Amino acid sequence: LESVDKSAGQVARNTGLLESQLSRHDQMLSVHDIRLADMDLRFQVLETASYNGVLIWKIRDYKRRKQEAVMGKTLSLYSQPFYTGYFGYKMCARVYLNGDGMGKGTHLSLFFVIMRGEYDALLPWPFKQKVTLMLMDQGSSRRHLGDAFKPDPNSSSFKKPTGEMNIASGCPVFVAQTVLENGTYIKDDTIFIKVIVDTSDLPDP
């Protein structure tokens, strides 16, 4: 037995059959998992996208996300896109809590983004809307640190997007880190930022 022992062994040339199939699943379950896990973000995102010219991005795990810009590894964070409506400007928002450039480690920089979202095409270009950038405190009234600024249509951050996102255009200078952490701006270890796109006087139906 060694010629037909392989006959009995043909049943072993079966192992690789069950095997090779199972492979097709760890693949899928993974791809699916990466997808399931993927559907989560999108579902955690669809729930938190403002539709009326304003934003309130809630930042937590703070002392975790500072030691990322401070010990360089996870510098900037972004909010969620917030539109003027459902089919318009996909204005995102990124935070440089430690800072970037002329306010890096001596200030907390926060800027206003503008994204490319289908309905850029039909909507008036270039961006030309007021954008009040403020900081929300958890405590009492607590002054809402931040300002706006009128878009200088010549700014290369207000064009009609051509790539996934735009050129930031906020303030590398916002709140001296020595004031942000010198308050309650980080209650329960969490901060909040309010964005305001002065839509006020705009052509309406």
Partner: peptide, 21 residues
């Protein structure tokens, strides 16, 4: 008669810090 703010630079490929002066 609007407002003159800051723009940014434009990313590259190599190591370096987010700068635009």
């Amino acid at each position: 008669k609007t407002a003159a703010p800051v723009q940014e630079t434009l990313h590259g490929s190599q190591p370096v810090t987010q700068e635009d002066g």
